[PDB]
Each structure stands twice: as structure tokens, then as C-alpha cells.
């Protein structure tokens, strides 16, 4: 399968940015968010307690295995179809996510609506979000809504973080975290 | 209803930033996202079609009328309680929102979990999001998930945008859009 050059070279694009402004969110923080949103946490509870109530997928990497862009003039409504693979820190494949995106806006920041279904050994979950692709190029983290569907994830919901993690790779790798409750 | 000095002076804080990087969304884009998320629209239709399917609140201004901070040592888990006013472009009051936030992370970017309920003339809706406050000071737009509660908004869902709009005010003014379907 093929990967559009814009995805292959996205890491290189990041390296040309003059704004290099990381702002990660750790999984404990993401678990507090997930538990608060699920009404299963109180902000006089302790963060490690939120983490204990959650299903946690961290120290995950993802990158594109297939990415096709269907361009429209001016870029508005351009569509993307992708399959990405999840790997652990050691490079072991854990699963895939199959999704599509729609370009909402190009300038000054490119924004995309993303929706995907992730399939791992122990179940599946959906991710949906409105993400600032220019902010990601400038190293920022973006957050998507996660809804569990099958297996271990069923009936649970939470959040996912996405950020570029190694811009020297082609295609680049992204750091991914998922917390559900 | 008093307003914590950090909220009063946040516009001045924004003006001290050296990264000034706005990236807004137009409502049509936001309507495309809302309609895609709700399964009422197809990537292959045209954007103005999505706009007609939606309830649209564009060009809103908001600012705090009350804001109380309950600080926690280290900044993480600090809570915020606020009441804000909505105005249209000409300055007519449309309603209010009362919200609660929790600081998730302080550095290198401050992140907050927000949840709020907006009360307008034709009903109420809830907004929930995980937002990068540092990105906001640097002029970026943040997106929250919206769920209608009552009236016209009931049974509808979509998105809200938030960005600083006049940092010269005390407290500063924000631009808001809400689109539901
Ligand atoms: C920063 C946001 C993007 C990261 C994603 C979300 C991360 C991951 C893990 C998956 C694989 C998708 C992502 N990877 C991509 O390469 C693209 C993605 O949406 C695109 O849409 C590109 C290929 C990328 C760049 C430019 C293209 C855009 C297609 C539409 C026209 C643009 O000129 C945008 C990416 O950097
Ligand atoms: C997303 C950026 C924030 C804008 C909000 C979301 C916008 C609006 C319209 C409503 C009214 C709330 C907001 N306004 C604020 O002043 C605060 C808010 O969360 C705070 O939390 C402050 C008072 C602000 C600054 C510093 C404080 C923080 C409280 C916690 C300790 C921080 O040191 C952060 C704001 O820039």
C-alpha cells in the first residue's frame, strides 16, 4: 500500500517550523479528565485514584501504513483515508486504527475532522476529534474523544492524546495515549 | 461576584507572549464537523449543506462575571468555578454559562478539564473539553464537545470553539462559536 508524500514527509515539515512548542499531557492527567467526564471522579479525589479506575494504553507509538489523500480545490473538503499501526516501545505491533479525515480549513491553521476505529488484541474503540494539524506540526498535543466498542473497552469512554514523537522518521511516528472508564 | 486577579489580568498575560499564532475555524467548517460527528452529513456533499443542517451560534463574545480559584499546592488539581456572560457582536446579552475546571498539568503547557452549562433564550447545552491554556494565551482556538440539554438544542450535539478575542479588556474577552445538529 501507498503513503502520500505529505504524510511521509510530515516529520520533515515539523523540522522546518520556527515554532517548536511541545505541551504534552501525561496519562495520569488524561485519566483525571476521563474520570471527571465520566462522572466517576471528584476533584477532591487524588490523581492516582483516577488512573486506577481507568483502562490505560500508554507508551504507544503509531504511524501510517496506508494513507491516501483525495484532494479538492483550495483544500477545503479534501479527504484522507488511513490505516495506522500501533507499536509498543520495543517495536512490537499491537494493532491498527482505520480511519478517515476531512479537511475543514487550511489557513492560517489546517484543521481536520478525524474519525477512526482501533482494533487491538483485546477489543476495539472509536476515536473522534477536531484537530489543529498546524499545532501538531509545531509539536503540540491534540485530544480526541474515545468511545469503547468491543471487548475490554465496551461501554467505556474517555480520551486519546496524539503528538509527533519522532520527526526524523518517514513516515513520522506519533506518541499515542488512550484512557477509558 | 468577584473575579480572581489572574482572570482579570489574563489578557495582559497573553500580550506578553512572543508566540502569537491564531488559527480559527469558520462556522461552516464547524458545521461540517458537527454534521459528520452526528452522522447527518457526508464528506462528499458541499459545506454549505452542512451549515443548513445545524443550529448555529456565530460571532459570540464571552467574558467572566465571576471567577473563583481554589488553589492546590503545585498547581495540579487547582479548581476553578466561573460564571460568564454571552453577548452578540453588537453587545446584546444572550445568556450566561456557569462552569467548573480542574488543572490537569502546569508545564510546559497548562491544561484544564472544563465542563459548563450555557443558558440562552432558546434553551441550554453542556460543553466538555480538555483544553491547552498555554495554546490559548498564544492565540490558538480550542474546541469543546457540545451536547444540547433543553429547548431547541435538545437531542442535538456538536462543537464549540473558544479563543481570546480582546486581550485589552479586564477581564479579557473571548470569541465563541457553537454549532449543533
Ligand atoms: C499534524 C496532523 C497530521 C497527523 C495525523 C493525524 C497523524 C496520524 C498518526 C495519522 C496517520 C493521520 C495524520 N497523519 C498524516 O500524515 C495526516 C494525518 O491526518 C494528513 O492528513 C496529512 C498527510 C498531514 C500533512 C499534510 C496533509 C495531510 C493530508 C491532507 C493535506 C495535507 O497537506 C497532516 C499530519 O501531519
Ligand atoms: C483557557 C485559558 C483560560 C480562559 C478561560 C477558559 C476562558 C473563559 C472565557 C472562562 C471565564 C474561564 C477561563 N478564564 C480564566 O481566566 C480562567 C479560565 O479557565 C482560568 O482558569 C485562569 C484564571 C486563567 C489564567 C490563569 C489561572 C487560571 C485559573 C487556574 C490557575 C491559573 O494560573 C486561564 C485562562 O487564560
UniProtKB/Swiss-Prot annotation, chains A, B:
The keyword Isomerase applies. (1S,3R,6R,8R,9R,11R,14S,15S,19R,20R)-8-ethyl-9,15-dihydroxy-3,4,6,20-tetramethyl-21,23-dioxo-24-azapentacyclo[20.2.1.0(1,6).0(11,20).0(14,19)]pentacosa-4,12,22(25)-trien-25-olate binds at residue 112. Its EC number is 5.-.-.-. Keywords: Antibiotic biosynthesis, Disulfide bond, Isomerase. Disulfide bonds join 54-181. One of its GO terms (molecular function) is isomerase activity. The keyword Protein biosynthesis does not apply. It holds the Pfam family AOC_like. It comes from the Bacteria. It catalyses: 4-[(1R,2R,4aS,5S,8aR)-2-[(2R,3R,5E,7E)-3-ethyl-2-hydroxy-5,7-dimethylnona-5,7-dien-1-yl]-5-hydroxy-1-methyl-1,2,4a,5,6,7,8,8a-octahydronaphthalene-1-carbonyl]-2-methylidene-5-oxo-2,5-dihydro-1H-pyrrol-3-olate = (1S,3R,6R,8R,9R,11R,14S,15S,19R,20R)-8-ethyl-9,15-dihydroxy-3,4,6,20-tetramethyl-21,23-dioxo-24-azapentacyclo[20.2.1.0(1,6).0(11,20).0(14,19)]pentacosa-4,12,22(25)-trien-25-olate. One of its GO terms (biological process) is antibiotic biosynthetic process. InterPro entries: AOC-like (IPR041013). Disruption phenotype: Cells lacking this gene lose the ability to produce pyrroindomycins. Pathway: Antibiotic biosynthesis. Involved in the biosynthesis of the spirotetramate antibiotics pyrroindomycins. Catalyzes the intramolecular cyclization forming the spiro-conjugate moiety in pyrroindomycins, via an exo-selective [4+2] cycloaddition reaction. Reaction occurs via a unique trapping mechanism whereby the lid-like action of the N-terminal tail imposes conformational constraints on the beta-barrel catalytic core, which enhances the proximity and polarization effects of reactive groups (1,3-diene and alkene) to drive cyclization in a regio- and stereo-specific manner. Homodimer. The N-terminal 10-AA residues are absolutely required for enzymatic activity. This is Spiro-conjugate synthase. It comes from Streptomyces rugosporus. The gene is pyrI4.
Amino acid at each position: 500500500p501507498q503513503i502520500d508524500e505529505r504524510a511521509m514527509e510530515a516529520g520533515a515539515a515539523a523540522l522546518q517550523e520556527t515554532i517548536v512548542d511541545p505541551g504534552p499531557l501525561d496519562v495520569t492527567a488524561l485519566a483525571v479528565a476521563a474520570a471527571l467526564a465520566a462522572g466517576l471522579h471528584s476533584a477532591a479525589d487524588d490523581p492516582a485514584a483516577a488512573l486506577d479506575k481507568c483502562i490505560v494504553l500508554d507508551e504507544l507509538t503509531e504511524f501510517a501504513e496506508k494513507l491516501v489523500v483525495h484532494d479538492r480545490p483550495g483544500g477545503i473538503g479534501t479527504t484522507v483515508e488511513y490505516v495506522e499501526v500501533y507499536e509498543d516501545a520495543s517495536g512490537v505491533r499491537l494493532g491498527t486504527a482505520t480511519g478517515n479525515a476531512v479537511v475543514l480549513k487550511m489557513e492560517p491553521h489546517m484543521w481536520q475532522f478525524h474519525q477512526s476505529v482501533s482494533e487491538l488484541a483485546d477489543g476495539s474503540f472509536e476515536a473522534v476529534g477536531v484537530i489543529d494539524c498546524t499545532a501538531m506540526l509545531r509539536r503540540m498535543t491534540q485530544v480526541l474523544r474515545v468511545t469503547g466498542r468491543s471487548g475490554r473497552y465496551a461501554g467505556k469512554s474517555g480520551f486519546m492524546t496524539l503528538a509527533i514523537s519522532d520527526p526524523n522518521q518517514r513516515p513520522p511516528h506519533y506518541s499515542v495515549q488512550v484512557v477509558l472508564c
